[PDB]
Each structure stands twice: as structure tokens, then as C-alpha cells.
Amino acid sequence: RPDFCLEPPYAGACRARIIRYFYNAKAGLCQTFVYGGCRAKRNNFKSAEDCLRTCGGA
């Protein structure tokens, strides 16, 4: 997985409530979080599948 998959999830400052996925490297899977709609970082996916494809190995 790329290093960005190890970063904590980033809601950012905006006020939307958008459900996104992040890789939780301690748990080893992708979890949901609430994203605010601006300034997304890379550990922020629209689906579990995309999160796991990107971050589940290497």
C-alpha cells in the first residue's frame, strides 16, 4: 500500500456530511468516516472496494 493509506482520515473544515472510506492500517481494513466536502486527502475513497484495491496490500 502507498504511504498515504497510513494517514488518519481527514474530515476537513467544510460542513457537508459525505460518507467516505479510509484505510485503518491498525485494523487492516477500510472503515467509514464523515467527510466535510473540501480539501480531501488521499486516504478518502468513495467505496470500500476502491479503498481496499488501493490500500489492502503493497
CATH assignment of 1-58? 4.10.410.10
Q: Which among 27, 24, 33, 31 is positioned nearest to 5, based on CA atoms?
A: 24
Compute the radius of gyration of the chain from its Cα atoms: 11
Q: Between the CA of residue 42 and those of 11, 22, 38, 55, what are the distances in Å? A: 12, 9, 12, 11
Which DSSP helix (H) or strand (E) runs through 53? helix 48-55
Q: How many CA atoms does the CB half-sphere of 4 hold within 13 Å? A: 10
Indicate the domain borders of the chain. Answer: 1-58
Strand partners, 31: 22
Q: Which residues contact 4 (CB under 8 A, 6 or more apart)?
A: 41, 42, 43
Q: Which residues contact 42 (CB under 8 A, 6 or more apart)?
A: 2, 4, 5, 7
Resolution to 1 decimal place, in Å: 1.0
Question: Distance between CA atoms of 30 and 38, rounded to whole angstroms?
Answer: 21
Tell me the longest C-alpha to C-alpha distance in the chain. 33
